[PDB]
Assembly symmetry: D2
């Protein structure tokens, strides 16, 4: 198997540790790191590589990403470069991707994915326990979108559709790399695209649980806009009824993960009152009253009680239809709109406890799916 | 929709309450109670029925079960009689079954099923939080069997395959009632059969979670042997890869359920030393040494440490191949064998806490599925 | 025993229920309700009383509170009126107080206190599980104060020093009513004074745990200022080393209590920007820089990250030394100061989970006790 | 301070690690290991000592225990030897004891005790989270005894009265070593005696919480009889009302501790049926019927449902009055009697979950204290 670590700016020792873990694994035949630019991380890896592959017997190499897509040159280009290399320059049966920033990485992650692949599956996705104010793009943007636009499909059931830790087999990777839609997604939209098109092609999927969680490095705005844009670009797509989808049963959350805070609330409330623009005030005219009045209040004081579940779904539709990717005002507006949803969820749900928050989030997708199936 | 309550011996007020709840529901067009015999429960319902249907506007009636199967006349005959009535004497689009003994029954159960049915599903199964020493037939017999015999299929993933609370639509019911295999299962085997053949036909299934649990009346032996027999009778069947199967994400277990005890341990230990027979001691010759020696010890003192996970799987295969349904010695032997498994799980797993027990049980099915895929 | 319910404005049926519970208890010899004014609740009780005491055999009566203290005529006057009545016009050995608003009241509360009293104790205080954003006066004002000013004593170890549910025996009541310091505390300061002087007199105290919690009616400002003022007035008091103090071991919090929210965050954030005054801005000159700059920001936008644990202790000392009871500006400033503490605790601690929040609060008192012992 | 590790047979590296931890601690001026005999552990320490003390600057030495008591030469003699050494041959202000077998020992244990000592306390006891089937001597024998014999005192409130991890200051040590009762307790009875007489002298006590628990090496019979014997020997003692006793607030149990099993159930059930004697059967004549009949059943099959809470208290009184220390039949009978109590608790309480078990155990002491205060 080929194991791939895409990296942009990262601590050399963190990446090197993961590289060494992967190389030492009996089922890994090659390690490839794909870099954004030729920075210090890059040179650090390039120096260590001869040594690592000499010690473990499995070859390790670095490359810059190629420009394969047509959006902002980001992780997509990184990942698709690995796909191309994997497909065109190696003979290996399977490819793994893991984020380079991971500090809780162990041989077990590779084993669990390899074993599931042996069982037949075409895509194996790792998924993790998460703090109740983490993963707000995942929940309020990706999974919400999937639920609202493809309620009868497997999409919204996938636990971590943005996750960069997965194993695909050669034919699945070929399938995706062929696909014009995924190829062009050079930015943060790439994981969304991998998730969507594998499901749309009826690839069978297993979700691995990694009980110890994904410790990593601790931009949010860019990721938010590009994820939403990814969903918007797919909105007219047609998806068949489910292929095989199974998920390893989750363990209880680790205490240290259940007990941490996703963000700085004071700073977020502040941020909500900044970067206003007469054009944004105008754009709000497109939204339902509660939302329009709600968000306008944020010029003077933080307001978010208005942005409950049903308000957010209404807002999501309007965004789907009018959001202009690349327009600074629309991006700021999406950022602010989403922020109020996060804040509302934080104060009315997250503050009720980890378990309450989980039961809520799942019920939220269910309510969205049901509503969607009504129209 | 038609709502059906199969009853044998039950407290009249308990059943009448459930009947009244169902009749009052806006989506229920008829209630049917199917009785084993014409006892006091029966006459109680028959007297109340004119009154209830007058007050709610939806018709309510009682009938004796018909003899439709070829095994012991039990619940199967009860449920298939309802199927027949539903298919042949009404025009309704959907049928529910709920156990008559349920005391925690509420309009919600009907709503959740009807809503899932609207979504498209062919079978909707209710499932509940359960005490860690409950559902030992479910886990050690049914789910174990499904995992060991059809590891690549959806069968072992179904949460409560013995569950009597479900909704099917007309074509799914027709399809089951048609089927020689389910029709003949007049005994406790019926839920196993409903579960098996719906999955084998690729019916799409949704599992509803009812967070408050299923409070009901608190024979075990009969149920055990007939459930095992059901599985044994299906052992040569071939099952395709999964159809659509989705399950509502579960809430945390209610405290009162997590904190209760499934059985009397002292009495069970005693029961293990009773009803011995020279023929049973001989039959043990067919089992691996640890098991044979283990079970033999039980003539003098309770012993069960020997009956771990791998020992039970070995035992299971031997049972599948040699267990003679209706033979008193085999039934007693199955009962004792299983009892050791339950005791072993109780002392080495359940005693470790509710969560540990759950993570264990799910991993057990996984280990069994993996092992089965190996041969 | 005499059981006493002090009431101001309450639902007649809620109080009448509690009255009836107490009167029906075999250990209760009289029930007394003490009213603030002769409103509808009062007339409701006065009408029902003859009937209740006829049915249960134990006498029930209502009275207006007398003016016995020298601050705002509030709960103190209510409770001391009961004390006077108890001591001067009855011969009973023990007196209970319970808030009239309680809806989870049961004969058990009385039993548990009566049994503890039998054991020998002089004061029995009931304490309950509480939502993690509840009891912010209790934690940030009363317990904090106790820990900061009397670190070596039992005071800060009392679970719910503001609690209105307790049982005292005749001599304890006599001792309190005698005391000019407690007599004069006619306002919300009274429970603080009851707690302080019983500990100062070395009365032996037992804390009863009521596992179901105290459901009650759902002013904050007046209570806040009067509680703080009570502490301030005691600040030069000397207190001896601990007498007997024991507390029933707590059960796990009920889910419904752990999962509810103390307050409306948006509204609180808004309130923090209101009722400013040039005089308040000036008064801030007396506080450390982080706090002064912090609170000032609140004229434009909510700010509270600055008001951590240590910042709060710093603030507390300044308040102890300069806060003028009755001065509208000081009262407003204390309200805002405390609100920022609550917000800080909410976002950095409470959001981490009920358990984390409890471990934190107890460590906070520890950190405060230690710090105080240093000077 | 002097830190003492008493050892009998232990893994050299485990003890040496703890010695090195203690010596490296800035507050520790000397380490002393006290051995049972001159075995391998002993020689291993004797060799390492020069080296350790050389490296840390704080002297380390080993000695055999002196024979100072009049019972079996065990741990008591070991600890009292340390006491003597401390008092007679050093000038140090404080002494710690820690079990030598501890594998989760850290500088933190010493710090927490030293800081509490700084606060004024005479005795500091460490206490830990424990598995719900651990500490059955502690609960069913020591705490139960203290509750039943001295209900109005602090004794039954001490968390871990058998605990070997504590810090005492010079005068407390002197006071104990002076005392004929404690001196003569050369066996396992010693911790019981340290606990009892410090409380009887009104020494102020603080209980430190060590949240990570006490991992140690995994005889039971001997310990059981000598702990019971200790309590029996004190039964006519008179104890005053409480001196100062405070306990650090506990954190949530670590998962790994909540999830482990204190013993082998099958083996225990077996053991209950062994080492019977006609004289034991006769001795049972002294006990209440349910118990006499119950225990007799154990000759044929395990029985324990009979040995609930009230049955155990009745049994305890009989034992207090008739148990003959040193009589093999009485010792066997106590062992069996206790074993049924443990089994009953295991099956009716422990199996209900860790929290339920704790709430139960504390209520048990409460029920016992109340019952005791009745006569
Ligand atoms: N090659 C490449 N890697 C990237 C790029 N952007 C992010 N990454 C890497 O993708 C992985 C996930 O990114 P990260 O910033 O940790 O986002 P996270 O998903 O929030 O954990 C990390 O290894 C990043 O170094 C990019 O533009 N090119
Ligand atoms: N008609 C009919 N109903 C039965 C028969 N046996 C059991 N039942 C009913 O089927 C439902 C489930 O039975 P129950 O004894 O509660 O088993 P459990 O809850 O699944 O353990 C109850 O309503 C019983 O009254 C039978 O032979 N005929
Ligand atoms: N007699 C009298 N009772 C009062 C007064 N103020 C409050 N109470 C009562 O004291 C009890 C506690 O007050 P409540 O408003 O519920 O405060 P809580 O402690 O936050 O629950 C209730 O029964 C009130 O009706 C007062 O001025 N006089
Ligand atoms: N000096 C001495 N130490 C002993 C004796 N018996 C036990 N110990 C030590 O006392 C400590 C506690 O004993 P241990 O067997 O671990 O019992 P437990 O941890 O309380 O169950 C350990 O360090 C033992 O090595 C004895 O007779 N003499
Ligand atoms: Co990352
Ligand atoms: Co039932
Ligand atoms: Co109230
Ligand atoms: Co030990």
């Amino acid at each position: 198997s080929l194991v791939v670590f895409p990296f942009k700016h990262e601590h050399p020792e963190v990446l090197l540790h993961n590289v060494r873990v992967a190389a030492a694994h009996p089922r890994v035949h090659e390690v490839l790191c794909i870099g954004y630019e030729r920075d210090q991380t890059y040179e650090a890896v390039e120096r260590a590589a001869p040594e690592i592959s000499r010690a473990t017997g499995t070859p390790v190499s670095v490359r810059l990403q190629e420009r394969l897509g047509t959006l902002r040159p980001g992780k997509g280009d990184g990942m698709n470069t690995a796909l191309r290399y994997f497909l065109e320059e190696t003979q290996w049966e399977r490819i793994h991707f893991y984020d380079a920033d991971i500090t809780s990485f162990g041989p077990d992650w590779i084993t669990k994915a390899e074993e599931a692949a042996d069982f037949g599956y075409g895509l194996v996705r790792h998924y993790f326990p998460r703090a109740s104010t983490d993963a707000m793009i995942t929940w309020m943007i990706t999974r919400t979108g999937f639920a609202l636009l493809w309620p009868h499909t497997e999409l919204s059931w996938i636990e971590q559709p943005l996750g960069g830790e997965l194993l695909m087999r050669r034919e699945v990777a070929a399938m995706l790399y062929e696909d014009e839609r995924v190829r062009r997604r050079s930015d943060w939209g790439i994981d969304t695209l991998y998730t969507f098109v594998t499901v749309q092609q009826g690839v069978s999927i297993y979700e691995c649980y990694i009980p110890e969680g994904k410790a990593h490095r601790l931009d949010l705005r860019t990721m938010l806009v590009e994820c939403f844009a990814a969903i918007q670009s797919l909105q007219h797509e047609v998806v068949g009824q489910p292929a095989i989808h199974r998920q390893e049963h989750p363990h209880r959350v680790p205490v240290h993960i259940a007990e941490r805070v996703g963000y700085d609330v004071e700073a977020t409330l502040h941020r909500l009152m900044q970067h206003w623009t007469p054009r944004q005030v105008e754009l709000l005219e497109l939204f339902t009253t509660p939302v329009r009045e709600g968000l306008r209040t944020c010029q003077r004081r933080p307001a978010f009680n208005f942005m409950d579940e049903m308000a957010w779904a209404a807002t999501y539709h309007v965004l789907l239809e009018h959001f202009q990717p690349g327009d600074p005002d629309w991006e700021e507006l999406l950022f602010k709109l989403w922020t109020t949803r996060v804040l509302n969820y934080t104060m009315t749900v997250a503050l009720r406890g980890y378990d309450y928050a989980q039961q809520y989030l799942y019920r939220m997708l269910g309510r969205y799916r049901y509503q969607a199936a009504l129209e």
